[PDB]
Each structure stands twice: as C-alpha cells, then as structure tokens.
Design a protein around this ligand. Sequence first.
Ligand SMILES: OC[C@H]1O[C@H](O)[C@H](O)[C@@H](O)[C@@H]1O
Ligand SMILES: OC[C@H]1O[C@H](O)[C@H](O)[C@@H](O)[C@@H]1O
Ligand SMILES: OC[C@H]1O[C@H](O)[C@H](O)[C@@H](O)[C@@H]1O
Ligand SMILES: OC[C@H]1O[C@H](O)[C@H](O)[C@@H](O)[C@@H]1O
Ligand SMILES: OC[C@H]1O[C@H](O)[C@H](O)[C@@H](O)[C@@H]1O
Ligand SMILES: [Ca+2]
Length: 760
Amino acid sequence: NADNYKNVINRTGAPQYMKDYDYDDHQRFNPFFDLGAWHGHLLPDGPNTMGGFPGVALLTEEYINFMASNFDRLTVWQDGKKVDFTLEAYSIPGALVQKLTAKDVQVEMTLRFATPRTSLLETKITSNKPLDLVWDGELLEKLEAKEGKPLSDKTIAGEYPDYQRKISATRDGLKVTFGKVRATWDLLTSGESEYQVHKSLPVQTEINGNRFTSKAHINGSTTLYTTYSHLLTAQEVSKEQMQIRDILARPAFYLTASQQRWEEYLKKGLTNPDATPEQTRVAVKAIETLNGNWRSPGGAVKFNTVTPSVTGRWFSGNQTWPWDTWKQAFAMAHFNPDIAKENIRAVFSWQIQPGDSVRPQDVGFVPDLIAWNLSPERGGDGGNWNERNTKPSLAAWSVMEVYNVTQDKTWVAEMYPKLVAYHDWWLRNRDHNGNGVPEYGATRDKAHNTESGEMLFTVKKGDKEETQSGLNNYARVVEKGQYDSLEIPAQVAASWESGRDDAAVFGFIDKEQLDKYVANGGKRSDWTVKFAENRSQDGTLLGYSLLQESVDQASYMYSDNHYLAEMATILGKPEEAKRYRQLAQQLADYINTCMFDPTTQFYYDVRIEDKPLANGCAGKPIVERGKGPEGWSPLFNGAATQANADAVVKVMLDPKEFNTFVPLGTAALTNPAFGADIYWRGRVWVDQFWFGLKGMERYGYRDDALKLADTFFRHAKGLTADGPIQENYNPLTGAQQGAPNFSWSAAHLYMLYNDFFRKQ
Ligand SMILES: OC[C@H]1O[C@H](O)[C@H](O)[C@@H](O)[C@@H]1O
Ligand SMILES: OC[C@H]1O[C@H](O)[C@H](O)[C@@H](O)[C@@H]1O
Ligand SMILES: OC[C@H]1O[C@H](O)[C@H](O)[C@@H](O)[C@@H]1O
Ligand SMILES: OC[C@H]1O[C@H](O)[C@H](O)[C@@H](O)[C@@H]1O
Ligand SMILES: OC[C@H]1O[C@H](O)[C@H](O)[C@@H](O)[C@@H]1O
Ligand SMILES: [Ca+2]
C-alpha cells in the first residue's frame, strides 16, 4: 500500500548551513524521521548528492540543526574509473529509496528506522565484476541562511567554540562526537552526544579535518547494511550498542517490521471510501507529518510525545504543548493510537501534584510547555519549559476520542483522575468572581510578580518606561490613562493561555485600526482588557484572570464537564456523572443567556464588569470588538440552543462575515481589527475551520459543512501539491503561512478527510 504514495512531501535537499532556514526561520527541507527518533534524513537532489541520503538532521534536545550535506555517500569505482549512474529517488510512508543504474552495475538503497535512536540502510549492489567502494562525507561549516542567502559569514565552529565536532574512525565505521553546548535558544548538547555509523562489512576510514573517506573492495554483487544513530547521552550510547548488533544480525526483520507498521497506519487511517485520490493523498501527508513529529522519551519527558513541527524554529526537539496535544491525539487515535495515548500522558506527566516545590497553589495545573530540559526553578537549564500559563482545555475530548477508537476502559480509568484534577484547578485558579464560569489567566511566577508577590508591570509613554508593581498601582494607572501602552507580563501570559495571542477579543488592534474605530465613534477604552489577581480565602496568591469571561473558554469547560460525565458513566461513577451533567447545564445556560447577542445573531466574550448585570451575567457581550471564531465554539462544543445555533450558522455562511474564499477565519470581515494577514484576526487555521464545520453539522447543517469542506479543498493553496503542511491561510487569497510540517494542521486535515472530504 505504501508504494501507492511516492513523494507525498518533497523530501529532497542538500542543506549548506546548520540553520538552513526559510523566511520564518524554519528548516526549509523536510527530513524523514520515524519511530520517535532524534535524527532524520533527506533524499538526494541529483548528481551532487546521489549515492547518499544527504542532510543529516540532528534534534539537539530542543532544536533541529543540520550536521552535514553529504555524509556516508557512496561512489562506485571500476579499475580507477567512477561508475556513471542515473538516479531514481523517492519517499514513501515510512521509507526513503534510491536506485542507481548503470549497464553492468546497479545499487538499490532502502532507508527505514529501526529503533528510537537508529536508522537502517540496506545497500544492495549488483555487479558482474569486482568493484571498489568509497564512502565520503563532510560536516557543514556555515552557520545560517534565509532562503539560500547567508545571514552572516559566521561559521558553526566560530559561533559555538565548545561544539568541537570530531570525526573518528571505529572498527565497524565511524562516529562524530560533540562537546557540551548550552545555547538555550539554538543548540543543546550534553557533551556525551554522538552520531554513529556502523556497517556489516570492514571499511578503511581516513579522516581529514571535518571530512572523511571510507573504502572497501568487493568481488561482485554484495548487500551490506549500515546503521546511523544519534545518541544524546552516554547512557544512550551504551544501550544502543546491543541494539545495533541485533539489527545487523537481522536486518531484514527490521525492514519488514517498519513495512508492516506503516501498512497498518495506512489500513487504520485511510477509511473514507468516498474520498478522491487527491483527498486520500492529503490524509497520507497528514499521517507522514504527525508520525515524523513524534519523539520518543528524552530528558525530562518520560513518554513518547508529538511536537508541533520537527522542522520548526521553536517547535522541535520534544517541546510539547497541551493545546496542540489534544488535537494531535484526536487525529492520531485513528491511525497511531499507541502514540496518541503517549502524547497525552506526556502532557499530564508534569501535572502539578500536592506539595509541589514550585507551585503548591496550582494542584491540577498542566504546564504550557514541557521539553527535554527543565526550567531553572526545577533544576534544569531549559529556557522553553513554561508554567506561566496553560492552554485551553480540550483534554477530555481528546482522551474520549482515543477511547472511541480503542474501546479501552483502562485508558479512561488511567486518565479520569488527571482530567478531574485539571478541571478542579480551573475552578479554583481561573474564576475570579466565583460564578462557575472560567477566565483565561496566568499563574504566580517569577516573570509575573516580585519576590513578595506584587504584580509587575511597565508603563510606557513616548520613549519613557516605568517599571512598577502592585495591583492597586496598576489600577490607578489604568484609571488615569496617561500612557501609550502598558506591559503586564502576567497579562501577556494570559494571551498565551487563550492560544490566540493577538485576537481582537483580547484587545489586540493596531494603531491605524484603533484610530479608525475611534474616528467612527468608538472609545479607545473599549479595547482595554482589565486584569485581576485571584486570591484564596487566606490571602494566598493563586494567579491572575482577565476581567473577561471568554465564550470559547466557557464552551470548552462545558465540553470538559460533558465528557467527564460520560467517562464517569463508563467507569460506573453515576453520582459523579450527575454532578458533571449539572455543571455542564449551568454553563450552557450562562453561555446562551449572557454570551449570545440577538441583535447581531452571534456569541461574544463578556466583560467582568464592576457589578454583574441584573440577570446575573458578569457583563454585557463585547459586541463592539466584532465577531470571531469563538462565536461558533458553543456550536462545536454543543452548548448552544438550536435557535442560537441557527442564527450563528447564517452569520458563518455570509460571505460578508466569514464565508470567504477560504472560509471561517479568525475574525469576520466586519471586525474592526480584521486583517487578512493577521494570524489571529483574519487568517484561517484548520482547527477553527474544522470546529466550525463540526458545530454546523451538530445542529443540522451537514449539507452546508460538506459544501464548505469542498470550498476549502478547492481554494486552500498547496493542498494537492507536495509541499509541507503549514499553519494558516489568507482568507481572501488562500495563501499559506507558518511553520512547515505543522502537526495540528495535519491533525485537522486528517479529520476533514475522515469527516467531510468526498468525491463531488
Ligand atoms: O519498500 C521500499 C522499496 O523496496 C524495494 O526497493 C522495492 O523495489 C520498492 O518498490 C519499494 O518501494
Ligand atoms: O500507549 C501504548 C503504548 O505505546 C508505546 O508502545 C509505549 O512505548 C508503551 O509504553 C505504551 O503503553
Ligand atoms: O511528575 C513530575 C512532577 O510533576 C509535577 O511537577 C508534580 O508537582 C511533581 O510532584 C512531580 O514530581
Ligand atoms: O516561562 C518561560 C518561557 O516560556 C515560554 O517558552 C516563552 O516563550 C518564554 O518567553 C518564557 O521565558
Ligand atoms: O513566545 C510566545 C509563545 O511562547 C510559548 O510558546 C507559548 O506557549 C505561546 O502561547 C506563545 O505564543
Ligand atoms: Ca468567572
């Protein structure tokens, strides 16, 4: 089956820089990774790289960095003359293949992964006469480029003097060793990491600086085996040796194991018999993408996980977020459920437990960002590890989907208490006014407050700054309004917690847009989101909330309660199920009463006003900031009444609001802060699009969802081509932007293939 899907993504390339970046700093080639391994390979691009799989990509703990262009590249010699081959090279799901053809000599190479640290190359040489084999390679020298244009003349060795890359011969191949580099934002090595090449036949290896040549003579047709391993610690180096020996003793078993594992992914995954071949191929792209972003345990992360992009500037190594994980695992449930389960475990594996040394006030909290290296507060030197905030919770929805596919009640039993603790955390730490309806917010953290717990902020006016602290001081400053801007680290973290960093609803609007809004009769203070601290009975600082209750947030809490009730029932906990159903109903009632605006036929966030409205709502819907995809969150999550859903769908299907060339973007065309190139104020993301279609379908509009899905399929640029999957689209043009090989796009593209794409 895998052979029906050649070169779904262009995996050719010959990188020339360690950071061989696209215009947004992501690696501009798409290496093949499998089995959660920490290195990847590219296909040759023609004569310069033919005979090898160039572009060894190393996942150095938290980043992707190229090691070499040619490395272990084969040329074949006959009586001193190089054999002249033609090249065929292609990817399939789970393998890279290249075939070199001459009249009297042929070479067939197959590269698959064998372990979570090791790939295996079969080199089959067919020849009527003896031959001399030569393998060569060279470490990269140049540091960084942007779309082929050097960003400087810096070298790798110049930029990282301690990297100290060294190639050495070994008895059965060679190795590259690396010194310890703790470049927090660029390059992270233990000082014990290595890249090893082991072969099934003796070779004589000569090293000259950062290049090597290995030589062997064969008397005729021979098949050899080579392992490549990136090993990140001394312990990994030691453990892998026995695995390498087993692979070389049974190479055909490892090739077969990979073949079979990939046939199973395709069998389990490709279940839409009404899909066109083009639609099916998109599903295969998504499967290749998600599986390549899977990482085996490493460092502080004791589980397999999936990152947002193995090639991403800030998304690589094993960096894991909850938001991305819920979407990832929902999709992967349908083809790689073992890793879907692991990805969810990874996120909860650092869930705050009672007596925590850093944040005992946050029991049940799930960190925003976990990775190889712990934060300094937890004894590591990682700069990415983040506990300033979490992300919106679709955790129960994700856990349920894995159950829906596997029917494994022990999985539900495993996750239920963790889901409950998270649920409880939202109600203690993200409900400033105690009404059962959460806000996005932030934690107590060294970035947010002084040693004594005073909230940090910086008041900016002209070129003058003023770093102050304390909530009451902040409150005065907002009241007086004599500043150009206010930077509150905790409120920045609250924007991160929402998952939509620059959305209109959270008060983000550029100067020109705001000047227009004000010039058309609005007040600039309409765009000010007030902020508050959350304290326990005894005065303890629990964290912070926006003084605003978000309709997507409320709808995800509805969802959380809804799925918990279903899991409670599955687990024979009927009184717990009853309580969750009651909490869901209350949230639905609040969403429909408080957050729906009849006049504009849509849902919106509400402010937490100084006093609640007479009807008990915390504030009026914030209609003046315009419409966004949060407006269909009550439909996606099932909190909406039919009547309110009918009203919302009419707005979604209006070309003057959301029914754009690529439909269901992150702000309506009528939103005062709309821009077609603004990530969270116009651009279309596949998750929000799919949430929209699902919400429509849920309320009787399957036929219209199917039509929007066809529109997306026809207008979303690049969908049927061989480029990597990116993050979002211009709603007016269909143009793509974002990190290549982006997991949650892949996940929702997969869902669309499963749920909505079909032959017309
Ligand atoms: O399994 C990977 C490859 O192995 C062999 O080279 C087959 O000839 C080829 O059809 C296949 O794609
Ligand atoms: O998630 C199911 C299984 O997936 C992977 O194989 C893990 O290595 C294993 O520990 C886990 O139990
Ligand atoms: O699981 C690793 C760690 O996760 C969280 O930080 C918990 O609060 C802590 O108790 C636990 O040791
Ligand atoms: O909280 C620690 C870190 O978390 C995240 O990785 C943020 O991107 C970074 O700005 C912050 O310093
Ligand atoms: O640097 C900003 C980014 O830092 C972290 O990755 C946060 O999880 C993300 O929400 C934020 O956009
Ligand atoms: Ca509240």
